[PDB]
CSV table of all heavy atoms in Angstrom, one decimal:
chain,number,residue,atom,x,y,z
N,1,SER,N,24.1,-13.8,72.0
N,1,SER,CA,23.6,-13.7,73.4
N,1,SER,C,22.8,-12.4,73.5
N,1,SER,O,22.7,-11.6,72.6
N,1,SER,CB,24.9,-13.5,74.3
N,1,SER,OG,25.9,-14.4,73.8
N,2,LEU,N,22.1,-12.3,74.7
N,2,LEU,CA,21.2,-11.2,74.9
N,2,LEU,C,20.2,-11.0,73.8
N,2,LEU,O,20.5,-10.4,72.8
N,2,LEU,CB,22.0,-9.9,75.1
N,2,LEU,CG,21.1,-8.8,75.5
N,2,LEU,CD1,20.9,-8.9,77.0
N,2,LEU,CD2,21.8,-7.4,75.2
N,3,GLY,N,19.0,-11.5,74.0
N,3,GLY,CA,17.9,-11.4,73.0
N,3,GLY,C,17.7,-10.0,72.6
N,3,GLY,O,17.4,-9.7,71.4
N,4,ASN,N,17.8,-9.1,73.5
N,4,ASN,CA,17.6,-7.7,73.2
N,4,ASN,C,18.5,-7.2,72.1
N,4,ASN,O,18.1,-6.4,71.3
N,4,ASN,CB,17.8,-6.8,74.5
N,4,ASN,CG,16.8,-7.2,75.6
N,4,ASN,OD1,15.7,-7.7,75.3
N,4,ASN,ND2,17.1,-6.9,76.8
N,5,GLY,N,19.7,-7.7,72.1
N,5,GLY,CA,20.7,-7.3,71.0
N,5,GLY,C,21.2,-8.6,70.3
N,5,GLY,O,22.3,-9.0,70.6
N,6,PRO,N,20.5,-9.1,69.4
N,6,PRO,CA,21.0,-10.4,68.7
N,6,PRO,C,21.8,-10.1,67.5
N,6,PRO,O,22.2,-11.0,66.7
N,6,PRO,CB,19.7,-11.0,68.3
N,6,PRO,CG,18.7,-9.9,68.0
N,6,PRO,CD,19.2,-8.7,68.9
N,7,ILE,N,22.2,-8.8,67.3
N,7,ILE,CA,23.1,-8.4,66.2
N,7,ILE,C,24.4,-9.1,66.2
N,7,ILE,O,25.1,-9.4,65.2
N,7,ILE,CB,23.2,-6.9,66.1
N,7,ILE,CG1,24.0,-6.5,64.8
N,7,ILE,CG2,24.0,-6.4,67.3
N,7,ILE,CD1,23.8,-5.0,64.6
N,8,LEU,N,24.9,-9.4,67.4
N,8,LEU,CA,26.2,-10.0,67.6
N,8,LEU,C,26.3,-11.3,66.8
N,8,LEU,O,27.3,-11.6,66.1
N,8,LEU,CB,26.5,-10.3,69.1
N,8,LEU,CG,28.0,-10.7,69.3
N,8,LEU,CD1,28.4,-10.4,70.7
N,8,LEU,CD2,28.1,-12.2,69.1
N,9,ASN,N,25.3,-12.1,66.8
N,9,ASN,CA,25.2,-13.4,66.1
N,9,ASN,C,25.4,-13.1,64.6
N,9,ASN,O,26.1,-13.9,63.9
N,9,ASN,CB,23.9,-14.1,66.3
N,9,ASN,CG,23.8,-14.5,67.8
N,9,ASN,OD1,24.8,-14.6,68.5
N,9,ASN,ND2,22.6,-14.7,68.3
N,10,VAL,N,24.8,-12.1,64.1
N,10,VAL,CA,24.8,-11.8,62.7
N,10,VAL,C,26.3,-11.4,62.3
N,10,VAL,O,26.8,-11.9,61.3
N,10,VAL,CB,23.9,-10.6,62.3
N,10,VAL,CG1,24.0,-10.3,60.8
N,10,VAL,CG2,22.5,-10.9,62.7
N,11,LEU,N,27.0,-10.6,63.1
N,11,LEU,CA,28.3,-10.2,62.8
N,11,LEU,C,29.3,-11.4,62.6
N,11,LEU,O,30.0,-11.5,61.7
N,11,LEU,CB,28.8,-9.2,63.9
N,11,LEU,CG,30.2,-8.6,63.4
N,11,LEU,CD1,30.0,-7.7,62.3
N,11,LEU,CD2,30.8,-7.9,64.6
N,12,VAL,N,29.2,-12.3,63.6
N,12,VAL,CA,30.1,-13.4,63.6
N,12,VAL,C,29.9,-14.3,62.4
N,12,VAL,O,30.9,-14.7,61.8
N,12,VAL,CB,30.0,-14.2,64.9
N,12,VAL,CG1,30.5,-13.4,66.1
N,12,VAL,CG2,28.5,-14.6,65.2
N,13,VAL,N,28.7,-14.6,62.0
N,13,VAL,CA,28.4,-15.4,60.9
N,13,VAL,C,28.9,-14.8,59.6
N,13,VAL,O,29.6,-15.5,58.8
N,13,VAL,CB,26.9,-15.7,60.8
N,13,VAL,CG1,26.6,-16.6,59.6
N,13,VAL,CG2,26.3,-16.3,62.0
N,14,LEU,N,28.7,-13.5,59.4
N,14,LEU,CA,29.2,-12.8,58.2
N,14,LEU,C,30.7,-12.9,58.1
N,14,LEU,O,31.2,-13.1,57.0
N,14,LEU,CB,28.7,-11.3,58.3
N,14,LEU,CG,29.1,-10.7,57.0
N,14,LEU,CD1,28.1,-11.2,55.9
N,14,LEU,CD2,28.9,-9.1,57.2
N,15,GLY,N,31.4,-12.7,59.2
N,15,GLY,CA,32.8,-12.7,59.2
N,15,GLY,C,33.4,-14.1,58.7
N,15,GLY,O,34.2,-14.1,57.8
N,16,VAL,N,32.8,-15.2,59.2
N,16,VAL,CA,33.3,-16.5,58.8
N,16,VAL,C,33.1,-16.7,57.3
N,16,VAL,O,34.0,-17.1,56.6
N,16,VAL,CB,32.5,-17.5,59.6
N,16,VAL,CG1,33.1,-18.9,59.3
N,16,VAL,CG2,32.8,-17.3,61.1
N,17,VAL,N,31.9,-16.4,56.8
N,17,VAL,CA,31.6,-16.6,55.4
N,17,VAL,C,32.6,-15.9,54.5
N,17,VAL,O,33.1,-16.4,53.6
N,17,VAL,CB,30.1,-16.2,55.2
N,17,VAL,CG1,29.8,-16.5,53.7
N,17,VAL,CG2,29.2,-17.0,56.1
N,18,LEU,N,32.8,-14.6,54.9
N,18,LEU,CA,33.6,-13.7,54.0
N,18,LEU,C,35.0,-14.3,53.9
N,18,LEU,O,35.6,-14.4,52.9
N,18,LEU,CB,33.7,-12.3,54.6
N,18,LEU,CG,34.3,-11.4,53.6
N,18,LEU,CD1,33.8,-9.9,53.9
N,18,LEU,CD2,35.8,-11.4,53.8
N,19,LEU,N,35.6,-14.7,55.1
N,19,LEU,CA,36.9,-15.2,55.1
N,19,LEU,C,37.1,-16.4,54.2
N,19,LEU,O,38.0,-16.5,53.4
N,19,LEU,CB,37.3,-15.7,56.5
N,19,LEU,CG,38.8,-16.1,56.6
N,19,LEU,CD1,39.7,-14.8,56.4
N,19,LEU,CD2,39.1,-16.7,57.9
N,20,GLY,N,36.1,-17.3,54.2
N,20,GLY,CA,36.2,-18.6,53.4
N,20,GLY,C,36.2,-18.2,51.9
N,20,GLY,O,37.0,-18.7,51.2
N,21,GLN,N,35.3,-17.4,51.5
N,21,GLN,CA,35.1,-17.0,50.1
N,21,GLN,C,36.4,-16.3,49.6
N,21,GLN,O,36.9,-16.7,48.5
N,21,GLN,CB,34.0,-16.0,49.9
N,21,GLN,CG,32.7,-16.8,50.3
N,21,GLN,CD,31.5,-15.8,50.2
N,21,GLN,OE1,31.6,-14.6,50.2
N,21,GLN,NE2,30.3,-16.3,50.1
N,22,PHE,N,37.0,-15.5,50.4
N,22,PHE,CA,38.1,-14.7,49.9
N,22,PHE,C,39.3,-15.6,49.7
N,22,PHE,O,39.9,-15.5,48.6
N,22,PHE,CB,38.5,-13.7,51.0
N,22,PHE,CG,39.6,-12.7,50.6
N,22,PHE,CD1,39.3,-11.5,50.0
N,22,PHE,CD2,41.0,-13.1,50.9
N,22,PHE,CE1,40.4,-10.7,49.6
N,22,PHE,CE2,42.0,-12.2,50.5
N,22,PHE,CZ,41.7,-11.0,49.8
N,23,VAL,N,39.6,-16.5,50.6
N,23,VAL,CA,40.8,-17.3,50.5
N,23,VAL,C,40.7,-18.3,49.3
N,23,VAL,O,41.7,-18.5,48.6
N,23,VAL,CB,41.1,-18.1,51.8
N,23,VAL,CG1,41.4,-17.1,52.9
N,23,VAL,CG2,39.9,-18.9,52.2
N,24,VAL,N,39.5,-18.9,49.1
N,24,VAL,CA,39.3,-19.9,48.1
N,24,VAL,C,39.6,-19.2,46.7
N,24,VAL,O,40.3,-19.7,45.9
N,24,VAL,CB,37.9,-20.5,48.2
N,24,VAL,CG1,37.7,-21.5,47.0
N,24,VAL,CG2,37.7,-21.1,49.5
N,25,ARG,N,38.9,-18.0,46.5
N,25,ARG,CA,39.0,-17.4,45.2
N,25,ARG,C,40.5,-16.9,44.9
N,25,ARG,O,40.9,-17.1,43.8
N,25,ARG,CB,38.1,-16.1,45.2
N,25,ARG,CG,36.7,-16.6,45.3
N,25,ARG,CD,35.7,-15.4,45.2
N,25,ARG,NE,36.0,-14.3,46.2
N,25,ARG,CZ,36.9,-13.3,46.0
N,25,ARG,NH1,37.5,-13.2,44.8
N,25,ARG,NH2,37.1,-12.5,46.9
N,26,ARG,N,41.2,-16.5,45.9
N,26,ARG,CA,42.5,-16.0,45.7
N,26,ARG,C,43.4,-17.2,45.2
N,26,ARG,O,44.2,-17.0,44.3
N,26,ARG,CB,43.1,-15.5,47.1
N,26,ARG,CG,44.5,-14.9,46.9
N,26,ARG,CD,45.0,-14.3,48.2
N,26,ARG,NE,45.3,-15.3,49.1
N,26,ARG,CZ,46.4,-16.0,49.1
N,26,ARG,NH1,47.4,-15.8,48.3
N,26,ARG,NH2,46.6,-17.0,50.0
N,27,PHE,N,43.3,-18.3,45.8
N,27,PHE,CA,44.1,-19.5,45.5
N,27,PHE,C,43.8,-19.8,44.0
N,27,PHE,O,44.8,-20.1,43.2
N,27,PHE,CB,43.8,-20.7,46.3
N,27,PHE,CG,44.7,-21.9,46.1
N,27,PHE,CD1,45.8,-22.0,46.8
N,27,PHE,CD2,44.3,-22.8,45.2
N,27,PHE,CE1,46.7,-23.1,46.6
N,27,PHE,CE2,45.1,-23.9,44.9
N,27,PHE,CZ,46.3,-24.1,45.7
N,28,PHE,N,42.6,-19.9,43.6
N,28,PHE,CA,42.2,-20.2,42.2
N,28,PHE,C,42.8,-19.2,41.3
N,28,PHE,O,43.3,-19.6,40.2
N,28,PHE,CB,40.7,-20.1,42.1
N,28,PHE,CG,40.2,-20.6,40.7
N,28,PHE,CD1,39.9,-21.9,40.5
N,28,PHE,CD2,40.0,-19.6,39.7
N,28,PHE,CE1,39.4,-22.3,39.2
N,28,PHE,CE2,39.6,-20.0,38.4
N,28,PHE,CZ,39.3,-21.4,38.2
N,29,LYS,N,42.9,-18.0,41.7
N,29,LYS,CA,43.5,-16.9,40.8
N,29,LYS,C,44.9,-17.3,40.4
N,29,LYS,O,45.3,-17.1,39.2
N,29,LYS,CB,43.5,-15.6,41.6
N,29,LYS,CG,43.9,-14.5,40.6
N,29,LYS,CD,44.0,-13.1,41.4
N,29,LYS,CE,44.3,-12.0,40.4
N,29,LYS,NZ,45.8,-11.9,40.2
N,30,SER,N,45.7,-17.8,41.3
N,30,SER,CA,47.1,-18.2,41.0
N,30,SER,C,47.1,-19.7,40.5
N,30,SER,O,47.7,-19.9,39.4
N,30,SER,CB,47.9,-18.1,42.3
N,30,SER,OG,47.2,-18.5,43.4
């Protein structure tokens, strides 16, 4: 939201991606 500050969109996308990668790798480890 707010074109002046579009950084919010970046933060949310990054969070989702990180969570997915972490959980998948952890399961494989065990």
Side-chain angles (χ1 to χ4, degrees):
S1 321
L2 188 80
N4 296 339
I7 187 164
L8 190 153
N9 296 339
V10 182
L11 186 71
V12 292
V13 180
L14 186 71
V16 181
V17 181
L18 191 153
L19 186 71
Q21 295 177 342
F22 185 90
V23 298
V24 180
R25 295 185 303 93
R26 187 176 69 82
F27 186 90
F28 185 90
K29 186 183 186 276
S30 40

